[PDB]
Amino acid sequence: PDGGFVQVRGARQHNLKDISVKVPRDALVVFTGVSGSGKSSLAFGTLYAEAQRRYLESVSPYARRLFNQAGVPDVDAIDGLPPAVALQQARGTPTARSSVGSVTTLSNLLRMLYSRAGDYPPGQGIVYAEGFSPNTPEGACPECHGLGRVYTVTEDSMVPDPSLTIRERAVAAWPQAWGGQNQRDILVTLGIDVDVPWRELPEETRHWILFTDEQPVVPVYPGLTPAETQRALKKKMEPSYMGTFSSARRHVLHTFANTESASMKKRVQGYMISEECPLCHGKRLRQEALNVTFAGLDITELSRLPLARVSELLRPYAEEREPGHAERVKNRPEQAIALQRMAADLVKRLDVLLHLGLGYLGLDRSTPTLSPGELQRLRLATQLYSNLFGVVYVLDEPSAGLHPADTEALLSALENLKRGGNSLFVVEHDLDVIRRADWLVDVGPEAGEKGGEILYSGPPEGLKHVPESQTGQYLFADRHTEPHTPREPAGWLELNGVTRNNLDNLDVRFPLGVMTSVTGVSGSGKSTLVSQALVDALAAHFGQGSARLGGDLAQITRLVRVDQKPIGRTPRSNMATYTGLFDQVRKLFAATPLAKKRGYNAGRFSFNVKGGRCEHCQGEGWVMVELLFLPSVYAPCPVCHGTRYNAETLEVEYRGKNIADVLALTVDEAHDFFADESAIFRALDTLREVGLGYLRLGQPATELSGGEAQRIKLATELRRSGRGGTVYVLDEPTTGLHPADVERLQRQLVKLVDAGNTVIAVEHKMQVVAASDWVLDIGPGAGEDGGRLVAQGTPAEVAQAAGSVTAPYLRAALR
Amino acid sequence: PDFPDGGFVQVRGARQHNLKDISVKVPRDALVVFTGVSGSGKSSLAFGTLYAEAQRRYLESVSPYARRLFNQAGVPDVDAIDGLPPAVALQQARGTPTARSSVGSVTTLSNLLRMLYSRAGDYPPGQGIVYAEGFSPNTPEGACPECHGLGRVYTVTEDSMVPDPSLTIRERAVAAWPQAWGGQNQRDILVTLGIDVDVPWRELPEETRHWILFTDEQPVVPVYPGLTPAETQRALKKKMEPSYMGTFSSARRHVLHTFANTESASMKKRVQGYMISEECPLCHGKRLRQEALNVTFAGLDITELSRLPLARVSELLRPYAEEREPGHAERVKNRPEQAIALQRMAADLVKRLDVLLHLGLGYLGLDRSTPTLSPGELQRLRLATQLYSNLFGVVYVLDEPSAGLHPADTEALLSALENLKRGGNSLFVVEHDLDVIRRADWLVDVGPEAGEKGGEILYSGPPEGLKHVPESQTGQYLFADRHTEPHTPREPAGWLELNGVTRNNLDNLDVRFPLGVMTSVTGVSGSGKSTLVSQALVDALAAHFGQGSARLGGDLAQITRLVRVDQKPIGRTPRSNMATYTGLFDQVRKLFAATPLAKKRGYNAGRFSFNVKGGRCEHCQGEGWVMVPSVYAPCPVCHGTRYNAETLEVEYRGKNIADVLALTVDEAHDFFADESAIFRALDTLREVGLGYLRLGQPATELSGGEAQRIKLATELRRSGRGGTVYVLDEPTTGLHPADVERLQRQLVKLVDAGNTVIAVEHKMQVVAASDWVLDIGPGAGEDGGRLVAQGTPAEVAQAAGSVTAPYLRAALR
Numbered sequence A: 001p002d003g004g005f006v007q008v009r010g011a012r013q014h015n016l017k018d019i020s021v022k023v024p025r026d027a028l029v030v031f032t033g034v035s036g037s038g039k040s041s042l043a044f045g046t047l048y049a050e051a052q053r054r055y056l057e058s059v060s061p062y063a064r065r066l067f068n069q070a071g072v073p074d075v076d077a078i079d080g081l082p083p084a085v086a087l088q089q090a091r092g093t094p095t096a097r098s099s100v101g102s103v104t105t106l107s108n109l110l111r112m113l114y115s116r117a118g119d120y121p122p123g124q125g126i127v128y129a130e131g132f133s134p135n136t137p138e139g140a141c142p143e144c145h146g147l148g149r150v151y152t153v154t155e156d157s158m159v160p161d162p163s164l165t166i167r168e169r170a171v172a173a174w175p176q177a178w179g180g181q182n183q184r185d186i187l188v189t190l191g192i193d194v195d196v197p198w199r200e201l202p203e204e205t206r207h208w209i210l211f212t213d214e215q216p217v218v219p220v221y222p223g224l225t226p227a228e229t230q231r232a233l234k235k236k237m238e239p240s241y242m243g244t245f246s247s248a249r250r251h252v253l254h255t256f257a258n259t260e261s262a263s264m265k266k267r268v269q270g271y272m273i274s275e276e277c278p279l280c281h282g283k284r285l286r287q288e289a290l291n292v293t294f295a296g297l298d299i300t301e302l303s304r305l306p307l308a309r310v311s312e313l314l315r316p317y318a319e320e321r322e323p324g325h326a327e328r329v330k331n332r333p334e335q336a337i338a339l340q341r342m343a344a345d346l347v348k349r350l351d352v353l354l355h356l357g358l359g360y361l362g363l364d365r366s367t368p369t370l371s372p373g374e375l376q377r378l379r380l381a382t383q384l385y386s387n388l389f390g391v392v393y394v395l396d397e398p399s400a401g402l403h404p405a406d407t408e409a410l411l412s413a414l415e416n417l418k419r420g421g422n423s424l425f426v427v428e429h430d431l432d433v434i435r436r437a438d439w440l441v442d443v444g445p446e447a448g449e450k451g452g453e454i455l456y457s458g459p460p461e462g463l464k465h466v467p468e469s470q471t472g473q474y475l476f477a478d479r480h481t482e483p484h485t486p487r488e489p490a491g492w493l494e495l496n497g498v499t500r501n502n503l504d505n506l507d508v509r510f511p512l513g514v515m516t517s518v519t520g521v522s523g524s525g526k527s528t529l530v531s532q533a534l535v536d537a538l539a540a541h542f543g544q545g546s547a548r549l550g551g552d553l554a555q556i557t558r559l560v561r562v563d564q565k566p567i568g569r570t571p572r573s574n575m576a577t578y579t580g581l582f583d584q585v586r587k588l589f590a591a592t593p594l595a596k597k598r599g600y601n602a603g604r605f606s607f608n609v610k611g612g613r614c615e616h617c618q619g620e621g622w623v624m625v626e627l628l629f630l631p632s633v634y635a636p637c638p639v640c641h642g643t644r645y646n647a648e649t650l651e652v653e654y655r656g657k658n659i660a661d662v663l664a665l666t667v668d669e670a671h672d673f674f675a676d677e678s679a680i681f682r683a684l685d686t687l688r689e690v691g692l693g694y695l696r697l698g699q700p701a702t703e704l705s706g707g708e709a710q711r712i713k714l715a716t717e718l719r720r721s722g723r724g725g726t727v728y729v730l731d732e733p734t735t736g737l738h739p740a741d742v743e744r745l746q747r748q749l750v751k752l753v754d755a756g757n758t759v760i761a762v763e764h765k766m767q768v769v770a771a772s773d774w775v776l777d778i779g780p781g782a783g784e785d786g787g788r789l790v791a792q793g794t795p796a797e798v799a800q801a802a803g804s805v806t807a808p809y810l811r812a813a814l815r
Numbered sequence B: 001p002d003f004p005d006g007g008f009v010q011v012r013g014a015r016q017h018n019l020k021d022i023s024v025k026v027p028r029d030a031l032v033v034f035t036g037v038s039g040s041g042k043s044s045l046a047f048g049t050l051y052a053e054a055q056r057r058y059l060e061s062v063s064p065y066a067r068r069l070f071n072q073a074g075v076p077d078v079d080a081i082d083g084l085p086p087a088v089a090l091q092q093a094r095g096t097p098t099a100r101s102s103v104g105s106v107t108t109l110s111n112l113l114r115m116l117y118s119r120a121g122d123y124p125p126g127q128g129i130v131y132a133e134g135f136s137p138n139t140p141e142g143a144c145p146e147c148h149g150l151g152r153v154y155t156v157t158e159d160s161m162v163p164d165p166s167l168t169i170r171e172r173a174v175a176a177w178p179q180a181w182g183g184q185n186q187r188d189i190l191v192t193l194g195i196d197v198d199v200p201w202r203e204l205p206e207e208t209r210h211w212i213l214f215t216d217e218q219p220v221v222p223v224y225p226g227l228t229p230a231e232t233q234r235a236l237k238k239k240m241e242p243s244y245m246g247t248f249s250s251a252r253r254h255v256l257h258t259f260a261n262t263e264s265a266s267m268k269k270r271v272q273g274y275m276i277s278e279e280c281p282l283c284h285g286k287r288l289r290q291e292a293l294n295v296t297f298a299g300l301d302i303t304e305l306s307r308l309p310l311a312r313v314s315e316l317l318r319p320y321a322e323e324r325e326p327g328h329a330e331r332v333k334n335r336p337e338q339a340i341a342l343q344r345m346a347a348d349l350v351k352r353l354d355v356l357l358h359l360g361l362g363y364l365g366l367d368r369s370t371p372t373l374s375p376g377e378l379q380r381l382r383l384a385t386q387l388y389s390n391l392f393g394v395v396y397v398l399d400e401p402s403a404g405l406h407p408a409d410t411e412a413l414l415s416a417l418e419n420l421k422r423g424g425n426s427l428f429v430v431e432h433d434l435d436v437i438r439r440a441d442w443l444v445d446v447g448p449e450a451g452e453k454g455g456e457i458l459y460s461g462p463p464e465g466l467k468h469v470p471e472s473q474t475g476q477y478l479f480a481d482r483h484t485e486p487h488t489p490r491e492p493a494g495w496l497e498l499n500g501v502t503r504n505n506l507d508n509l510d511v512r513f514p515l516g517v518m519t520s521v522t523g524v525s526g527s528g529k530s531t532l533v534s535q536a537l538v539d540a541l542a543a544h545f546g547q548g549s550a551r552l553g554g555d556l557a558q559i560t561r562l563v564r565v566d567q568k569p570i571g572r573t574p575r576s577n578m579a580t581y582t583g584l585f586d587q588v589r590k591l592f593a594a595t596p597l598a599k600k601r602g603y604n605a606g607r608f609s610f611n612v613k614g615g616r617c618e619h620c621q622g623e624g625w626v627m628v629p630s631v632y633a634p635c636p637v638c639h640g641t642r643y644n645a646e647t648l649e650v651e652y653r654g655k656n657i658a659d660v661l662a663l664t665v666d667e668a669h670d671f672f673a674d675e676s677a678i679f680r681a682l683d684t685l686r687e688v689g690l691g692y693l694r695l696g697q698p699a700t701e702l703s704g705g706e707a708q709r710i711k712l713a714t715e716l717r718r719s720g721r722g723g724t725v726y727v728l729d730e731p732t733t734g735l736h737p738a739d740v741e742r743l744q745r746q747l748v749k750l751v752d753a754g755n756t757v758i759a760v761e762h763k764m765q766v767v768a769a770s771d772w773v774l775d776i777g778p779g780a781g782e783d784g785g786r787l788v789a790q791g792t793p794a795e796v797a798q799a800a801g802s803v804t805a806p807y808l809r810a811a812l813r
């Protein structure tokens, strides 16, 4: 072997400059540099992606070489690369629905614990591990079928307005557009009156239409009048098609049970009535599996509890000290010999999770309600007992949402993963992790076209000799922005009686016209206080658990919340259209000599309206390849190749650029081009100020990270902030930002507080907390151990506070 | 002699199938061979435990949520495996249907030469670039417009649609129309239309027949069933209301429309009887567009190049890679960029073709279909393909990569395995070849014997240490020199002649086979053995009896029947098993008609059949298994049983109908010691060696070597008395050296009954036990196809120009 190195040659994915790099296998390798520099294009876009393509084409020959539909990484050669697992899902994909207990494997193991070692009634038999699950017919309650809720449909729920005629869509529960008129045309063949108000039809007919199970198949004649339909039938003319009846109930319940669309399920649900299952009053299973207990609890009630509580309930059984042990060993059949080996097996797994500070989560907790750093940490933990050997793990900021007090627990789980025979590729901004890495790859001087090169590949200590590196400057040369003097409050906002999750009746104060950081351990309650409780207390006070508002209210006009979520879920969405600037752009195209010749208006230049867009992709530029059965991805449209418009629309040029020429423009280049178009140039200016000059006007939203989307939403709200009055609530606003980037972000947050506005930011890094004007330290620990206001004041005041876990770290930050 | 500790895969508590709770260590980064008797557990451990786990653990890690659920039928019984990396299997699962492919795609080579034809290659001087997809017959861009890339086209004709023209339309002149209402309807349409259905077809005007048969017109008319023609016309005149409105459809329309759109098996075939198949008029059997056909290289279109031996393809590409073709310098002088391109693209083709040629596979064409390949042939294609993949740090898992190999060619196989390993990969091989086993780094010997008597680990270490392990049957053959006694060859009862044989490798070849004796047909891989035996001999015999070119005729008077016994599965779904195949289930189902419980209810001998409605399960309809690559799962309703609750309330001597299906042959032999029509049949299956198989074990759980022996066992007693020729392709498929000694006995058995057995053979263990040998082709393909030697094994052991002679000679000690 030529070292234990992976060797990469000719990598030019996105902005990579046809680079060569080598990286050790069996080591913690960290990929670093500013955002937009090309760190992900390398670790994920190139390394992970080539490693996975190769494996799957070997396990599924030709039956997976569909790959070039989706795309290949742009790279000459990679040698020495094992198979790869990404511990994060792809950029623009929906997270699937799970529980914490499913992703950790734990829920299965405790079905076998209830099946073999649990406390049955006086004499009930034995219930199998398959029958402690709501998803199996051996486990699911027969009333609700494991749903926990019972669903009905009525005439009132399905026909909200009975003055309507059947042709007037009186039965609203039927599908929109064509599917609704089909059923209506089926009824005219059957000789029912479609042009008479609903309530005037016999009860017998109204019942049938709404409730029958019957599905007759009848000739249908579109566009005929009732009378001329009956003459068609009588004279035996060719039916256009044969239609199949479906009652209103049939359609509603089949649509509910079976569709994959999320908005359709929500429409259908508007014509339904919802009630709790009475055979399992909340729980979801047979009442015989529910009789089998443990520590006084059936599976359901144990599952509500935090992982930490389940752990300390389980271990007396593992260490052989239950309420007595000599009580049932002289009588035991197998039970005690199986209960011992399982309670220890479960608690060994649980220690891994608990040591990663994840013991505040409940095993019934839904995966989409979890932060990106929470689920990547629960996936890390699961790997640590998975027994996988000889793979590469590809991680994307596993310290996101982590308190500095907890990084040694993260660092220690990564070394254990390494020591199991694996290699770790980690894109990280945390200087504490970068410092502990075996090897590091520093990418690009800057972002985009001015980045994409390798500044350094070697152990961290040698970065001290490369001066073009901004990682090396923070790490070794002491880059500060010099201290920040706290600004004085203008008023005080009171949030009293905050009941929610781990907060009992907690009373807290937020100062106004000032910037506050809300800090604390993971699972403390910051997100529960700020994002959940605060936000939907003052959304209720305006025109868009418990809580109560108070304080100097007459100072607050608007609430603006800035989330981490994408700007859109599909490639329709982009900066151009989210900022609102595309509207004037289309105006400028509609005013050109050639557009004027043809009868084009600005509408021709929309990709959201039929006419001038490519209709093959409906103007999205990109097409879904449901060829990938593991989360589907996007390929460029085979007809427009990503331009989004037909050929005739692209013949029109405003100042030597077609409309796709402008959407392909970087924020920086469009800043040049639109200098003298006032409203466009100003939108682009806030996007530039906030660090996104490398992005393209039309770049689809599915290609964007959480921090790129957060900053777009912020910029949209940056110039609207004339004077004060708006409270901005922000979750970790420096997500995916380099220490050098946050300096540029913080200046813009200063600007909007100068305007008279109040920013409240849930915050995890002391760099940002050190330049606040006020600080709220939440809860001692996580979960039951947290939830208290534990310190409040200026950063300098709080850096000396007692019974604070962030204090020492804030203090190290302050200078 | 060097293994670093903790460089090992550590298995603990493995009990898959017949495995007896075993723990083994095997080293990674080595050739690891898994050896033992048949039915002993070699594949339960290698594929069922080690491959299956690596796979489960990766798939769960790549997609947690949605894919922790596929395992609805998949979970190996094993406590622990440390040290295990990702796995790649070079032979697909047991019961999966072979994917439709060609050699060209499997190897990736086809795509490289579409690319070559696109960028390099000679265009007619008025046409532009054809892209790589324009050269495939599987895309809209490349597939010929009329045949859609099939190369074949169907027509209909007056003669195919109306066989007997003397007939009238009313007495079914046009026989191509549907049978019952459908034909009656078209006739009634013609009476309404005023056409004469009561005159011989031949005496209708020329344009009436052409219209009835070919027109695309479809008038819609009033239909009056039952009326006479004269009554029909006055029903029309006075506008009498009809039964329904009928739409005319021509003989041609009916036939072509039904064939293309029908979803019935019996329809398609019926309608196909009236249609004629022919080479496609546009492409002439080459299945591509005329514009792709016009692009040439070395004088040939891509299709003509794709039908050449991989060896010839390498020898025309090779000059261009090496820059030594005639007049090269004047090519770079006059067309520099095509010279550059051609060279680059020829170079990576040549480089990959070299790997294939070094294994022994340069005799295949790139258009050769993969379902027509042997298993060893394609696993070796698959091996070769991995050698130019860039996979690092995986375990490859192989199942007899040496099946079909000549002992002259095993060293080429060993070089290939070594090259793979040194890529930073590990190798798990299940093997019976003693020469491969001799060279392994490590060796896992399984069980003493089969099923219940095996499943334990006899040895795990370097091959030589197997001398201190006396209970091991592989060690006996490999170190103790275990062998049979020498065989004296029987005299032929006659000689059948196969003359003028012309196909594939062979042109006008004359051959004789001795009757009443066992013959082995041997020679190197690709030399022509299966073509002679499995193809020409079998085709010529099945034609001579009721049931390429060659003519027979020696002592033909002495044979009456042909039966071929192949490696092909006994059936393709779980519906088929060993019980139902032999037919012993007829007596079992009838014994369940003898129970007094089956008298209280009217239980017809036919409630116990899973093949007919009634007493079977109604989610799987008696398969007992459900579809979920594709793998099988247990039924949601009958729970892997086949039967409903009512049927399984009847027991025969404390045994249900399902219980008896769960019976191993060896057990059923004890339990049915009195039911002659069952016992006798169970006793053939034991003689053959299949006592470890369950009576109703899905056909899809069987190996192929196992299916072959079930076929042979069905023959052993119908061989009873009579004159049948048996043709067998490698009767020793998944058999250990100790298993073949007892299969010989069964082959001798049907010769003693006055039969003739002809086997295409690769192991000199059985060739030594033959009465005659036919040695084919000096080498493979175009270097083969000749009869180089013939005689008793001793006679051929001494042949000069024969490559198998030295090995046969050695095997004769």
Ligand SMILES: Nc1ncnc2c1ncn2[C@@H]1O[C@H](COP(=O)(O)OP(=O)(O)O)[C@@H](O)[C@H]1O
Pocket (backbone or CB within 6 Å): A014, A015, A033, A034, A035, A036, A037, A038, A039, A040, A041, A042, A091, A448, A694, A695, A702, A703, A704
């Ligand atoms: N999934 C993706 N699809 C398309 N473009 C991408 C994707 N990820 C990154 N890019 C682009 O690659 C360039 C480099 O950015 P990136 O790879 O994200 O570096 P970093 O990880 O340091 O932010 C940017 O122009 C960015 O928009």
Ligand SMILES: Nc1ncnc2c1ncn2[C@@H]1O[C@H](COP(=O)(O)OP(=O)(O)O)[C@@H](O)[C@H]1O
Pocket (backbone or CB within 6 Å): A360, A361, A362, A365, A369, A501, A502, A520, A521, A522, A523, A524, A525, A526, A527, A528, A529, A782, A783, A784
């Ligand atoms: N959607 C939810 N469902 C159930 N419990 C939740 C939810 N959100 C938060 N919690 C619980 O609240 C406590 C911490 O609140 P959170 O705001 O999530 O902490 P932080 O934001 O500091 O990480 C934890 O015990 C956590 O499990």
Ligand SMILES: Nc1ncnc2c1ncn2[C@@H]1O[C@H](COP(=O)(O)OP(=O)(O)O)[C@@H](O)[C@H]1O
Pocket (backbone or CB within 6 Å): B017, B018, B036, B037, B038, B039, B040, B041, B042, B043, B044, B045, B094, B451, B692, B693, B700, B701, B702
């Ligand atoms: N795919 C399979 N499905 C079900 N049973 C199997 C399968 N493969 C092997 N078995 C069973 O396991 C036992 C051992 O066979 P096997 O592991 O194939 O040994 P060997 O590989 O040495 O022939 C046999 O009873 C056989 O029927």
Ligand SMILES: Nc1ncnc2c1ncn2[C@@H]1O[C@H](COP(=O)(O)OP(=O)(O)O)[C@@H](O)[C@H]1O
Pocket (backbone or CB within 6 Å): B363, B364, B365, B368, B372, B504, B505, B523, B524, B525, B526, B527, B528, B529, B530, B531, B532, B780, B781, B782
């Ligand atoms: N089904 C087939 N289609 C096309 N060519 C074939 C087919 N079967 C065999 N051949 C060719 O015939 C020659 C001899 O092959 P074969 O009879 O299969 O040899 P063997 O039985 O010794 O392996 C080879 O050139 C091979 O490529």
Ligand SMILES: [Zn+2]
Pocket (backbone or CB within 6 Å): A141, A142, A143, A144, A145, A146, A147, A148, A149, A277, A278, A279, A280, A283, A284, A285
């Ligand atoms: Zn219920």
Ligand SMILES: [Zn+2]
Pocket (backbone or CB within 6 Å): A614, A615, A616, A617, A618, A619, A621, A622, A637, A638, A639, A640, A641, A642, A644, A645
């Ligand atoms: Zn398009």
Ligand SMILES: [Zn+2]
Pocket (backbone or CB within 6 Å): B144, B145, B146, B147, B148, B149, B150, B151, B152, B280, B281, B282, B283, B284, B285, B286, B287, B288
């Ligand atoms: Zn054709």
Ligand SMILES: [Zn+2]
Pocket (backbone or CB within 6 Å): B617, B618, B619, B620, B621, B622, B624, B625, B635, B636, B637, B638, B639, B640, B642, B643
């Ligand atoms: Zn069933």
